[PDB]
Amino acid sequence: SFSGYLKLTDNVYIKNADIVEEAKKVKPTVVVNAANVYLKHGGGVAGALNKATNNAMQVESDDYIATNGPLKVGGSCVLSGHNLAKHCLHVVGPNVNKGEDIQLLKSAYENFNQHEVLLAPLLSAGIFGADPIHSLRVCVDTVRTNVYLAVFDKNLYDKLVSSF
Ligand SMILES: CC(C)C(=O)NCc1nc2ccccc2[nH]1
C-alpha cells in the first residue's frame, strides 16, 4: 500500500519517488503512463515503465494501436499493468515540445476520474515540456479520485511542495 506520501489535498498525495520502483512496491490497481498518441514508450516515464515490463507494454501497445489507431491528445486507454500494476492507464497529456495545446492538460487529467485510486506522474511534465507546477495545479483542480503522484526529481518535488 501507498506509504511516505505527503497529503496536498483531500484526494491528492505526493512523493519523491521513481514511479517504476513505486509501482513494483505498491502493485497498485492502476499506474498511469505518460503516454503519447502512438503508445511509443521511448523515454521519460513511458520508456521507464516499458523497460520495467521487459518491453511487454510496448508489444501490447503496438497491438492496441494496430487495432484502434492512435489515441487523441487528452485521451487515454486502459491496458495491462504487467508486472507493475493490475492496469496501466495510458494518458496522453499535451506535449509542449511538439507545440500541443496546454489547455488539453485538464482533459488529460479528467481520465483519472474513471479510477478510484491511481499511482501517477504529473502529466505533461518532464520531457513533455509543461511546467510541473502548472501540471500539479491542474491535477488538484481536476482529479476528484485518489491520486498518488510520484515525482522523480527531488529538487522538483521540493519546489512543488514548497510552492503549493
Ligand atoms: C527503474 C529505474 C532503474 C529506472 O528505470 N530509472 C530510469 C527512469 N527514468 C524515468 C523517468 C521518469 C520517471 C521514472 C523514471 N525512471
Short mmCIF file of N, CA and C and ligand atoms in Angstrom, two decimals:
data_model
loop_
_atom_site.label_atom_id
_atom_site.label_comp_id
_atom_site.label_asym_id
_atom_site.label_seq_id
_atom_site.Cartn_x
_atom_site.Cartn_y
_atom_site.Cartn_z
N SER A 1 0.82 -1.22 0.00
CA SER A 1 0.00 0.00 0.00
C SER A 1 0.86 1.28 0.00
N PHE A 2 0.28 2.40 -0.44
CA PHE A 2 0.99 3.67 -0.56
C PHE A 2 1.51 4.16 0.78
N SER A 3 2.81 4.50 0.85
CA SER A 3 3.39 4.99 2.09
C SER A 3 4.41 6.11 1.84
N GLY A 4 4.56 7.00 2.82
CA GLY A 4 5.51 8.09 2.70
C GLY A 4 5.05 9.27 1.87
N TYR A 5 3.76 9.30 1.49
CA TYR A 5 3.24 10.40 0.69
C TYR A 5 2.88 11.57 1.56
N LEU A 6 3.04 12.75 1.02
CA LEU A 6 2.64 13.98 1.68
C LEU A 6 1.24 14.29 1.15
N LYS A 7 0.31 14.61 2.04
CA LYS A 7 -1.05 14.93 1.62
C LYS A 7 -1.12 16.37 1.18
N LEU A 8 -1.55 16.64 -0.05
CA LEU A 8 -1.69 18.01 -0.55
C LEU A 8 -3.12 18.49 -0.39
N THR A 9 -4.08 17.63 -0.72
CA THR A 9 -5.49 17.98 -0.64
C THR A 9 -6.25 16.74 -0.09
N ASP A 10 -7.60 16.79 -0.09
CA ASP A 10 -8.47 15.70 0.30
C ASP A 10 -8.12 14.42 -0.46
N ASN A 11 -7.77 14.56 -1.75
CA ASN A 11 -7.54 13.39 -2.59
C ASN A 11 -6.23 13.34 -3.32
N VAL A 12 -5.38 14.34 -3.19
CA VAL A 12 -4.09 14.35 -3.89
C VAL A 12 -2.94 14.22 -2.92
N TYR A 13 -2.08 13.23 -3.18
CA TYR A 13 -0.90 12.91 -2.38
C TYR A 13 0.32 12.96 -3.28
N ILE A 14 1.49 13.22 -2.68
CA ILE A 14 2.71 13.36 -3.50
C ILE A 14 3.92 12.79 -2.80
N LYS A 15 4.87 12.27 -3.57
CA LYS A 15 6.07 11.66 -3.00
C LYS A 15 7.22 11.80 -3.98
N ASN A 16 8.45 11.94 -3.47
CA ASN A 16 9.62 11.98 -4.35
C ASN A 16 9.93 10.53 -4.53
N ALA A 17 9.63 9.99 -5.72
CA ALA A 17 9.83 8.59 -5.96
C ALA A 17 9.92 8.34 -7.46
N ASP A 18 10.57 7.24 -7.79
CA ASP A 18 10.63 6.74 -9.13
C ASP A 18 9.34 5.92 -9.26
N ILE A 19 8.49 6.31 -10.21
CA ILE A 19 7.21 5.64 -10.38
C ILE A 19 7.34 4.16 -10.71
N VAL A 20 8.43 3.75 -11.37
CA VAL A 20 8.64 2.32 -11.64
C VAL A 20 8.87 1.58 -10.32
N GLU A 21 9.78 2.12 -9.45
CA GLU A 21 10.04 1.47 -8.18
C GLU A 21 8.81 1.49 -7.28
N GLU A 22 8.06 2.58 -7.34
CA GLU A 22 6.84 2.71 -6.58
C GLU A 22 5.81 1.68 -7.04
N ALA A 23 5.63 1.52 -8.36
CA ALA A 23 4.70 0.52 -8.88
C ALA A 23 5.13 -0.89 -8.48
N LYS A 24 6.44 -1.21 -8.58
CA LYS A 24 6.91 -2.54 -8.19
C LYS A 24 6.65 -2.83 -6.72
N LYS A 25 6.69 -1.82 -5.88
CA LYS A 25 6.48 -1.96 -4.44
C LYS A 25 4.99 -2.03 -4.08
N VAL A 26 4.21 -1.08 -4.59
CA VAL A 26 2.80 -0.91 -4.26
C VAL A 26 1.92 -1.93 -4.97
N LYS A 27 2.27 -2.25 -6.22
CA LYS A 27 1.46 -3.05 -7.15
C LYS A 27 0.03 -2.48 -7.21
N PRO A 28 -0.10 -1.19 -7.53
CA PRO A 28 -1.41 -0.56 -7.45
C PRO A 28 -2.38 -1.13 -8.44
N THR A 29 -3.67 -0.83 -8.25
CA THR A 29 -4.68 -1.25 -9.22
C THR A 29 -4.41 -0.55 -10.55
N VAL A 30 -4.02 0.73 -10.50
CA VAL A 30 -3.75 1.49 -11.71
C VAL A 30 -2.48 2.29 -11.58
N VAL A 31 -1.60 2.13 -12.54
CA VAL A 31 -0.46 3.01 -12.72
C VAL A 31 -0.73 3.81 -13.99
N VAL A 32 -0.51 5.11 -13.96
CA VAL A 32 -0.69 5.96 -15.12
C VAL A 32 0.60 6.08 -15.85
N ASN A 33 0.54 5.92 -17.17
CA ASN A 33 1.70 6.16 -18.01
C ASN A 33 1.54 7.51 -18.70
N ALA A 34 2.65 8.23 -18.82
CA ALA A 34 2.69 9.48 -19.55
C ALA A 34 2.90 9.08 -20.99
N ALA A 35 1.81 8.74 -21.63
CA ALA A 35 1.84 8.19 -22.97
C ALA A 35 1.83 9.22 -24.09
N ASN A 36 2.19 8.81 -25.32
CA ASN A 36 1.96 9.65 -26.49
C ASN A 36 0.86 8.93 -27.29
N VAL A 37 0.32 9.62 -28.30
CA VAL A 37 -0.81 9.07 -29.05
C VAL A 37 -0.50 7.78 -29.75
N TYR A 38 0.77 7.53 -30.04
CA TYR A 38 1.16 6.30 -30.73
C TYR A 38 1.48 5.17 -29.77
N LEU A 39 1.45 5.43 -28.45
CA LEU A 39 1.88 4.47 -27.45
C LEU A 39 3.31 3.98 -27.73
N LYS A 40 4.18 4.91 -28.15
CA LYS A 40 5.58 4.56 -28.39
C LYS A 40 6.33 4.98 -27.15
N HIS A 41 6.64 4.00 -26.31
CA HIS A 41 7.16 4.24 -24.96
C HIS A 41 8.67 4.32 -25.02
N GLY A 42 9.17 5.39 -25.59
CA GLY A 42 10.60 5.52 -25.82
C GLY A 42 11.42 6.04 -24.67
N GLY A 43 10.93 7.08 -24.02
CA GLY A 43 11.67 7.77 -22.98
C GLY A 43 10.78 8.33 -21.91
N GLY A 44 11.38 9.04 -20.97
CA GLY A 44 10.62 9.59 -19.84
C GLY A 44 9.95 8.49 -19.05
N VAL A 45 8.80 8.80 -18.44
CA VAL A 45 8.06 7.82 -17.68
C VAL A 45 7.69 6.61 -18.54
N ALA A 46 7.26 6.84 -19.78
CA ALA A 46 6.83 5.71 -20.62
C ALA A 46 7.95 4.75 -20.92
N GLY A 47 9.12 5.27 -21.23
CA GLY A 47 10.28 4.42 -21.50
C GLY A 47 10.69 3.63 -20.28
N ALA A 48 10.62 4.26 -19.09
CA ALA A 48 10.97 3.59 -17.87
C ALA A 48 9.97 2.52 -17.50
N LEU A 49 8.66 2.80 -17.63
CA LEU A 49 7.64 1.79 -17.31
C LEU A 49 7.76 0.65 -18.30
N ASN A 50 7.92 0.97 -19.59
CA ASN A 50 8.03 -0.11 -20.57
C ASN A 50 9.25 -0.99 -20.31
N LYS A 51 10.41 -0.36 -20.04
CA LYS A 51 11.62 -1.14 -19.74
C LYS A 51 11.41 -2.07 -18.54
N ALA A 52 10.66 -1.61 -17.54
CA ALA A 52 10.38 -2.44 -16.36
C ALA A 52 9.53 -3.65 -16.71
N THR A 53 8.72 -3.54 -17.80
CA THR A 53 7.91 -4.68 -18.25
C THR A 53 8.66 -5.55 -19.24
N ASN A 54 9.97 -5.34 -19.45
CA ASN A 54 10.72 -6.17 -20.39
C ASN A 54 10.16 -6.00 -21.81
N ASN A 55 9.61 -4.81 -22.13
CA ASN A 55 9.03 -4.47 -23.42
C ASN A 55 7.65 -5.05 -23.65
N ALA A 56 7.08 -5.76 -22.68
CA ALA A 56 5.74 -6.34 -22.85
C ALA A 56 4.70 -5.24 -23.00
N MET A 57 4.88 -4.09 -22.33
CA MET A 57 3.97 -2.97 -22.51
C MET A 57 3.97 -2.48 -23.95
N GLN A 58 5.17 -2.41 -24.57
CA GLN A 58 5.24 -1.95 -25.95
C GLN A 58 4.63 -2.95 -26.93
N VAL A 59 4.84 -4.24 -26.69
CA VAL A 59 4.25 -5.26 -27.56
C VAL A 59 2.71 -5.19 -27.49
N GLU A 60 2.19 -5.05 -26.27
CA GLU A 60 0.75 -4.93 -26.10
C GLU A 60 0.24 -3.65 -26.73
N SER A 61 0.99 -2.55 -26.57
CA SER A 61 0.61 -1.26 -27.10
C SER A 61 0.59 -1.27 -28.61
N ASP A 62 1.57 -1.91 -29.25
CA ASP A 62 1.59 -1.95 -30.72
C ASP A 62 0.39 -2.70 -31.25
N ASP A 63 -0.03 -3.78 -30.58
CA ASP A 63 -1.24 -4.49 -30.98
C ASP A 63 -2.45 -3.58 -30.80
N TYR A 64 -2.51 -2.84 -29.68
CA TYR A 64 -3.61 -1.92 -29.46
C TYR A 64 -3.70 -0.86 -30.57
N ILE A 65 -2.56 -0.27 -30.96
CA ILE A 65 -2.57 0.75 -32.00
C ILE A 65 -2.91 0.13 -33.35
N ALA A 66 -2.44 -1.08 -33.62
CA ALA A 66 -2.76 -1.72 -34.90
C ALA A 66 -4.26 -1.92 -35.04
N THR A 67 -4.93 -2.21 -33.92
CA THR A 67 -6.37 -2.42 -33.96
C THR A 67 -7.16 -1.13 -33.91
N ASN A 68 -6.73 -0.17 -33.08
CA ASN A 68 -7.55 1.01 -32.80
C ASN A 68 -7.11 2.31 -33.35
N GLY A 69 -5.86 2.40 -33.79
CA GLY A 69 -5.31 3.67 -34.23
C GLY A 69 -4.85 4.45 -33.00
N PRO A 70 -4.27 5.62 -33.28
CA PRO A 70 -3.72 6.43 -32.20
C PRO A 70 -4.76 7.00 -31.29
N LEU A 71 -4.32 7.29 -30.08
CA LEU A 71 -5.17 7.96 -29.11
C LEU A 71 -5.26 9.44 -29.53
N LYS A 72 -6.09 10.20 -28.82
CA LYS A 72 -6.20 11.62 -29.04
C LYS A 72 -5.32 12.23 -27.96
N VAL A 73 -4.75 13.43 -28.20
CA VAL A 73 -4.09 14.18 -27.12
C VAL A 73 -5.23 14.56 -26.11
N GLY A 74 -5.01 14.25 -24.85
CA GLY A 74 -6.04 14.44 -23.84
C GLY A 74 -6.77 13.15 -23.55
N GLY A 75 -6.57 12.11 -24.38
CA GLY A 75 -7.26 10.85 -24.19
C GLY A 75 -6.46 9.81 -23.47
N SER A 76 -7.06 8.62 -23.36
CA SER A 76 -6.43 7.55 -22.63
C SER A 76 -6.95 6.21 -23.09
N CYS A 77 -6.25 5.17 -22.70
CA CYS A 77 -6.73 3.81 -22.82
C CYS A 77 -6.22 3.01 -21.65
N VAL A 78 -6.97 1.97 -21.28
CA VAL A 78 -6.60 1.07 -20.22
C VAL A 78 -6.04 -0.17 -20.82
N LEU A 79 -4.81 -0.49 -20.45
CA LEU A 79 -4.17 -1.71 -20.88
C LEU A 79 -3.65 -2.45 -19.63
N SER A 80 -2.96 -3.57 -19.82
CA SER A 80 -2.43 -4.32 -18.70
C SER A 80 -1.37 -3.50 -17.97
N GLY A 81 -1.27 -3.72 -16.69
CA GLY A 81 -0.22 -3.13 -15.88
C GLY A 81 0.99 -4.05 -15.82
N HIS A 82 0.91 -5.24 -16.45
CA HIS A 82 2.03 -6.17 -16.49
C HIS A 82 2.52 -6.51 -15.08
N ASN A 83 3.83 -6.43 -14.84
CA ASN A 83 4.40 -6.70 -13.53
C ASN A 83 4.38 -5.49 -12.60
N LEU A 84 3.79 -4.37 -13.05
CA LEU A 84 3.81 -3.13 -12.28
C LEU A 84 2.55 -2.79 -11.55
N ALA A 85 1.43 -3.28 -12.04
CA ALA A 85 0.11 -2.89 -11.55
C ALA A 85 -0.92 -3.84 -12.16
N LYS A 86 -2.20 -3.79 -11.71
CA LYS A 86 -3.23 -4.56 -12.38
C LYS A 86 -3.45 -3.95 -13.79
N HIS A 87 -3.60 -2.64 -13.86
CA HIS A 87 -3.84 -1.94 -15.12
C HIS A 87 -2.90 -0.78 -15.29
N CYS A 88 -2.64 -0.44 -16.54
CA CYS A 88 -1.94 0.78 -16.85
C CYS A 88 -2.93 1.66 -17.58
N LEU A 89 -3.13 2.88 -17.06
CA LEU A 89 -3.93 3.85 -17.75
C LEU A 89 -2.97 4.72 -18.53
N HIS A 90 -2.95 4.55 -19.84
CA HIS A 90 -2.07 5.34 -20.70
C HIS A 90 -2.74 6.63 -20.99
N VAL A 91 -2.23 7.73 -20.47
CA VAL A 91 -2.85 9.04 -20.64
C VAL A 91 -1.98 9.95 -21.44
N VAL A 92 -2.53 10.58 -22.45
CA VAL A 92 -1.76 11.49 -23.30
C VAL A 92 -1.96 12.93 -22.90
N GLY A 93 -0.99 13.49 -22.20
CA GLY A 93 -1.03 14.91 -21.94
C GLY A 93 -0.44 15.64 -23.14
N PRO A 94 -0.77 16.93 -23.32
CA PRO A 94 -0.17 17.69 -24.42
C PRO A 94 1.35 17.77 -24.28
N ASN A 95 2.05 17.62 -25.40
CA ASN A 95 3.49 17.73 -25.42
C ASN A 95 3.75 19.13 -25.92
N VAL A 96 4.20 19.99 -25.01
CA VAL A 96 4.53 21.37 -25.34
C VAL A 96 5.72 21.39 -26.30
N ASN A 97 6.64 20.42 -26.20
CA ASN A 97 7.80 20.35 -27.11
C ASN A 97 7.41 20.02 -28.56
N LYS A 98 6.17 19.54 -28.78
CA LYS A 98 5.60 19.31 -30.11
C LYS A 98 4.53 20.39 -30.46
N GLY A 99 4.45 21.46 -29.68
CA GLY A 99 3.51 22.56 -29.88
C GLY A 99 2.04 22.27 -29.60
N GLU A 100 1.74 21.29 -28.74
CA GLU A 100 0.36 20.93 -28.44
C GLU A 100 -0.30 21.85 -27.41
N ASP A 101 -1.60 22.04 -27.55
CA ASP A 101 -2.39 22.93 -26.70
C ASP A 101 -2.34 22.52 -25.23
N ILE A 102 -1.68 23.34 -24.38
CA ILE A 102 -1.61 23.11 -22.93
C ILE A 102 -3.00 23.03 -22.30
N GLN A 103 -4.02 23.65 -22.93
CA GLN A 103 -5.39 23.57 -22.44
C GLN A 103 -5.89 22.13 -22.41
N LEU A 104 -5.28 21.20 -23.20
CA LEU A 104 -5.66 19.80 -23.17
C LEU A 104 -5.19 19.06 -21.93
N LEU A 105 -4.42 19.73 -21.04
CA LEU A 105 -3.95 19.06 -19.85
C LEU A 105 -5.11 18.74 -18.92
N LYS A 106 -6.12 19.64 -18.84
CA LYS A 106 -7.26 19.34 -17.97
C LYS A 106 -8.04 18.13 -18.51
N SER A 107 -8.23 18.04 -19.85
CA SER A 107 -8.87 16.85 -20.42
C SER A 107 -8.10 15.59 -20.12
N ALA A 108 -6.75 15.69 -20.17
CA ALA A 108 -5.94 14.54 -19.87
C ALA A 108 -6.14 14.07 -18.41
N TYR A 109 -6.16 15.02 -17.45
CA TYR A 109 -6.39 14.63 -16.07
C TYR A 109 -7.78 14.10 -15.80
N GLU A 110 -8.77 14.51 -16.61
CA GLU A 110 -10.13 14.01 -16.40
C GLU A 110 -10.21 12.50 -16.55
N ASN A 111 -9.27 11.90 -17.33
CA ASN A 111 -9.28 10.44 -17.43
C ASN A 111 -9.06 9.77 -16.07
N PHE A 112 -8.34 10.46 -15.15
CA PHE A 112 -8.06 9.85 -13.85
C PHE A 112 -9.35 9.63 -13.05
N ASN A 113 -10.39 10.45 -13.32
CA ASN A 113 -11.64 10.34 -12.58
C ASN A 113 -12.43 9.07 -12.81
N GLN A 114 -12.02 8.28 -13.79
CA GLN A 114 -12.65 7.00 -14.03
C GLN A 114 -12.06 5.87 -13.17
N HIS A 115 -11.10 6.19 -12.26
CA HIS A 115 -10.46 5.19 -11.45
C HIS A 115 -10.43 5.72 -10.04
N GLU A 116 -10.82 4.89 -9.07
CA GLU A 116 -10.91 5.32 -7.68
C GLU A 116 -9.59 5.71 -7.09
N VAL A 117 -8.54 4.99 -7.45
CA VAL A 117 -7.22 5.28 -6.93
C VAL A 117 -6.17 5.00 -7.99
N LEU A 118 -5.18 5.91 -8.09
CA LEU A 118 -4.15 5.76 -9.11
C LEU A 118 -2.81 6.17 -8.58
N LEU A 119 -1.78 5.51 -9.09
CA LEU A 119 -0.39 5.94 -8.94
C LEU A 119 -0.08 6.67 -10.24
N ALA A 120 0.41 7.90 -10.20
CA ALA A 120 0.62 8.65 -11.42
C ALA A 120 1.78 9.59 -11.43
N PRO A 121 2.26 9.93 -12.61
CA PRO A 121 3.22 11.01 -12.72
C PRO A 121 2.43 12.31 -12.98
N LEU A 122 3.10 13.47 -12.92
CA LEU A 122 2.48 14.71 -13.32
C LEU A 122 2.42 14.71 -14.83
N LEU A 123 1.20 14.85 -15.36
CA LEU A 123 1.04 14.83 -16.81
C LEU A 123 1.68 16.02 -17.45
N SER A 124 2.22 15.82 -18.65
CA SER A 124 2.86 16.83 -19.46
C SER A 124 4.13 17.38 -18.84
N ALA A 125 4.58 16.84 -17.73
CA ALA A 125 5.83 17.29 -17.11
C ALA A 125 7.01 16.50 -17.76
N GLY A 126 8.23 16.75 -17.29
CA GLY A 126 9.38 16.04 -17.81
C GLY A 126 9.59 16.37 -19.26
N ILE A 127 9.85 15.30 -20.06
CA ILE A 127 10.12 15.52 -21.47
C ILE A 127 8.95 16.04 -22.27
N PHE A 128 7.73 16.11 -21.67
CA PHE A 128 6.60 16.70 -22.38
C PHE A 128 6.61 18.23 -22.34
N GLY A 129 7.51 18.82 -21.55
CA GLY A 129 7.73 20.25 -21.62
C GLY A 129 6.87 21.25 -20.89
N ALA A 130 5.83 20.78 -20.20
CA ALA A 130 4.97 21.72 -19.47
C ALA A 130 5.61 22.02 -18.12
N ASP A 131 5.14 23.10 -17.49
CA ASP A 131 5.59 23.47 -16.18
C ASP A 131 4.95 22.49 -15.20
N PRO A 132 5.76 21.75 -14.44
CA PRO A 132 5.18 20.79 -13.49
C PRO A 132 4.35 21.45 -12.38
N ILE A 133 4.66 22.70 -12.02
CA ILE A 133 3.86 23.43 -11.02
C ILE A 133 2.43 23.62 -11.56
N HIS A 134 2.34 23.94 -12.86
CA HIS A 134 1.04 24.08 -13.52
C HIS A 134 0.35 22.74 -13.57
N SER A 135 1.10 21.69 -13.93
CA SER A 135 0.51 20.35 -14.02
C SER A 135 -0.08 19.89 -12.69
N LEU A 136 0.60 20.20 -11.57
CA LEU A 136 0.09 19.84 -10.25
C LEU A 136 -1.17 20.62 -9.93
N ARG A 137 -1.22 21.88 -10.32
CA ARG A 137 -2.38 22.73 -10.11
C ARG A 137 -3.57 22.17 -10.87
N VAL A 138 -3.36 21.80 -12.14
CA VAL A 138 -4.46 21.23 -12.93
C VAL A 138 -4.89 19.89 -12.35
N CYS A 139 -3.93 19.07 -11.92
CA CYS A 139 -4.25 17.81 -11.27
C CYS A 139 -5.17 18.01 -10.05
N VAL A 140 -4.78 18.91 -9.14
CA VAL A 140 -5.57 19.12 -7.94
C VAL A 140 -6.94 19.70 -8.24
N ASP A 141 -7.03 20.54 -9.27
CA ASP A 141 -8.30 21.16 -9.62
C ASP A 141 -9.14 20.34 -10.57
N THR A 142 -8.67 19.16 -11.01
CA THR A 142 -9.43 18.35 -11.96
C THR A 142 -9.73 16.97 -11.42
N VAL A 143 -8.74 16.33 -10.80
CA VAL A 143 -8.91 14.98 -10.32
C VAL A 143 -9.66 14.98 -9.01
N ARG A 144 -10.72 14.19 -8.93
CA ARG A 144 -11.51 14.04 -7.71
C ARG A 144 -11.29 12.71 -7.03
N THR A 145 -10.73 11.71 -7.76
CA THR A 145 -10.42 10.42 -7.21
C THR A 145 -9.05 10.48 -6.51
N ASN A 146 -8.66 9.41 -5.84
CA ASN A 146 -7.43 9.42 -5.04
C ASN A 146 -6.19 9.22 -5.92
N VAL A 147 -5.38 10.27 -6.06
CA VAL A 147 -4.20 10.20 -6.91
C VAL A 147 -2.92 10.35 -6.10
N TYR A 148 -2.02 9.38 -6.25
CA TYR A 148 -0.74 9.33 -5.57
C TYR A 148 0.29 9.69 -6.61
N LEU A 149 0.84 10.88 -6.52
CA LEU A 149 1.78 11.38 -7.51
C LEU A 149 3.19 11.02 -7.14
N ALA A 150 3.94 10.48 -8.09
CA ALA A 150 5.35 10.17 -7.88
C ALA A 150 6.15 11.17 -8.69
N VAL A 151 7.03 11.93 -8.03
CA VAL A 151 7.83 12.93 -8.70
C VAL A 151 9.25 12.45 -8.60
N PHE A 152 9.84 12.12 -9.74
CA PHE A 152 11.19 11.56 -9.76
C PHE A 152 12.28 12.48 -9.20
N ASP A 153 12.32 13.73 -9.64
CA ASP A 153 13.40 14.63 -9.21
C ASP A 153 13.13 15.21 -7.82
N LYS A 154 14.07 15.02 -6.87
CA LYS A 154 13.94 15.55 -5.51
C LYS A 154 13.80 17.06 -5.50
N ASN A 155 14.62 17.73 -6.31
CA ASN A 155 14.60 19.17 -6.36
C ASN A 155 13.26 19.70 -6.84
N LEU A 156 12.66 19.04 -7.85
CA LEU A 156 11.35 19.44 -8.33
C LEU A 156 10.29 19.11 -7.29
N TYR A 157 10.39 17.96 -6.63
CA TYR A 157 9.43 17.58 -5.60
C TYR A 157 9.38 18.65 -4.49
N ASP A 158 10.58 19.10 -4.08
CA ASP A 158 10.63 20.12 -3.03
C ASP A 158 10.03 21.43 -3.48
N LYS A 159 10.27 21.80 -4.74
CA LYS A 159 9.71 23.02 -5.31
C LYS A 159 8.19 22.91 -5.40
N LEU A 160 7.69 21.74 -5.80
CA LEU A 160 6.25 21.52 -5.92
C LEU A 160 5.57 21.65 -4.55
N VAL A 161 6.14 21.01 -3.52
CA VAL A 161 5.54 21.07 -2.19
C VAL A 161 5.65 22.47 -1.61
N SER A 162 6.85 23.05 -1.64
CA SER A 162 7.08 24.38 -1.07
C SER A 162 6.32 25.49 -1.75
N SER A 163 5.92 25.33 -3.02
CA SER A 163 5.15 26.37 -3.71
C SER A 163 3.66 26.07 -3.81
N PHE A 164 3.20 24.94 -3.25
CA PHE A 164 1.79 24.54 -3.36
C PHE A 164 0.85 25.51 -2.68
C1 LIG B 1 13.62 1.59 -12.52
C2 LIG B 1 14.75 2.58 -12.65
C3 LIG B 1 16.11 1.90 -12.55
C4 LIG B 1 14.62 3.33 -13.97
O1 LIG B 1 14.09 2.82 -14.96
N1 LIG B 1 15.12 4.57 -13.98
C5 LIG B 1 15.06 5.40 -15.16
C6 LIG B 1 13.87 6.32 -15.08
N2 LIG B 1 13.64 7.31 -15.93
C7 LIG B 1 12.43 7.87 -15.50
C8 LIG B 1 11.70 8.94 -16.00
C9 LIG B 1 10.50 9.27 -15.38
C10 LIG B 1 10.03 8.54 -14.29
C11 LIG B 1 10.75 7.47 -13.78
C12 LIG B 1 11.96 7.16 -14.40
N3 LIG B 1 12.91 6.19 -14.14
#
